[PDB]
Amino acid sequence: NHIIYRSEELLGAASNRYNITVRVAKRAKENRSEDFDSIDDPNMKPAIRAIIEMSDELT
């Protein structure tokens, strides 16, 4: 339930709701390409981790 709070605080503080979506998708693609090894966890998807990291840099 924290990921919808982070998504709401990431959308509310963005200058454009359509540019922040493309930036989250680009960071999620980088997170998926950098974690290409199989040592991972199913509860932390690349898009969820990108939203978490971008909300943590947002503060």
Add this chain to the structure above:
Amino acid sequence: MTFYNYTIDKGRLKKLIALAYRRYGSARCSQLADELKELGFRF
């Protein structure tokens, strides 16, 4: 906060949801509607 010492109908619930979508956001508003949903079902 506001106490609301009266009888609750559909329009006043809509007013409360519209007020919660002014200072809290979408997710807290949906959580409030979820709690009001389960309270109304129980009673």
Add this chain to the structure above:
Amino acid sequence: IPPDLRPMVQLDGGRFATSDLNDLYRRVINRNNRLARLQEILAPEIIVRNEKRMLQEAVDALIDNGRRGRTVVGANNRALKSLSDIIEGKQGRFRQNLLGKRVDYSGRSVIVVGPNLKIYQCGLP
């Protein structure tokens, strides 16, 4: 038109399934070859004149059936679908295959109520 856009497939049972564009092209080619045959052997002008009018009506039915004269029909008096009929309507190319499509990775089922289940969550079988 290319032949894979007017396909001729065979059904299980031996019967062939054809498209209506092949009959119109067949009429155009038949009347064209008969007109060349009549002009070769110097037929009278009342016969060559009726053959040119029939070729004229054959090209018009291929492009837009029933636009000018009698509508060319098929087996059960159903009108043949033409080059403008495959694009011009709500069953044409635009409204049935370009602005809306059937998609992969999809399904459907009946819906039931979901109490004791949150918002942003659906119960998927």
